[PDB]
């Protein structure tokens, strides 16, 4: 839901 | 290293206005959302706004103390984001911090503006070299859960923040092993197994609801 992107 | 640069505090008058900025190099800054954090004695922490991709059409979501006289934004081609304050007051006055990536990873140096719903962590913990430490972060509002994606965050002098952990338990890249994240007992939690001198620092936690985050109080280590 937030900035998931590693 | 990736380089986050700030610019553009200073010493203003209550009912101005400001702009920072915020550039980045050493990661591809596009892919990212982008936030601003601030820090005061009148406890910061505290999460100011956020700024998501160019295909999600730049949305934005702000904290609700500065809704309508805040405005984030970024420049993709020039790898920077900035805030436009108005209307500033008392109450604004702190340390500005651009950070993003997984999700608080990295941390702009800081640039102070002087103008002139709880998480809870232990207030401080004392440990010693080779030590195990765990240190922990509950939600008033129930069972922490993955949901919340708790990130930790470390804080050493003067105002120099390090993201360690994100997504509950994922170590962000360069981040000594020692360091981990847990759910415990219906909290976050952060161990370090083995405490070393230079773990002497402030940590906070931030936990996320829906679309926004609540920052800890933060503790205070001190290793003897």
């Known amino acids: 839901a937030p900035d998931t992107r590693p | 290293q990736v380089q986050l640069q700030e610019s553009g505090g200073g010493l203003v008058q209550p009912g101005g206005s400001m702009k920072l900025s915020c550039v980045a190099s050493?990661?591809?800054?596009?892919?990212?959302?982008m936030n601003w954090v601030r820090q005061s004695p009148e406890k910061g922490l505290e999460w100011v706004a956020e700024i998501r991709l160019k295909s999600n059409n730049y949305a934005t979501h702000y904290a609700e103390s500065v809704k309508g006289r805040f405005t984030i934004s970024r420049d993709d081609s020039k790898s920077s984001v900035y805030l436009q304050m108005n209307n500033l007051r008392a109450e604004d006055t702190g340390i500005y911090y651009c950070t993003g990536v997984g999700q608080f990873a990295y941390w702009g140096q800081g640039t102070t503006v002087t103008v002139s719903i709880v998480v809870t962590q232990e207030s401080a913990l004392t440990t010693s070299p080779g030590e195990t430490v765990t240190l922990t972060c509950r939600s008033s509002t129930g069972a922490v859960t993955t949901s919340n994606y708790a990130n930790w965050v470390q804080e050493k002098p003067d105002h120099l923040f390090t993201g360690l952990i994100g997504?509950?338990?994922n170590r962000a890249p360069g981040v000594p092993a020692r360091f981990s994240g847990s759910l415990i007992g219906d909290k976050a939690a952060l161990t370090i197994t083995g405490a070393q001198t230079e773990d002497e620092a402030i940590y906070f936690c931030?936990?996320?609801?829906?679309?926004?985050?609540?920052f800890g109080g933060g503790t205070k280590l001190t290793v003897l």
């Open positions: 050493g990661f591809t800054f596009s892919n990212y959302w």
């Open positions: 997504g509950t338990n």
């Open positions: 931030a936990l996320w609801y829906s679309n926004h985050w609540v």
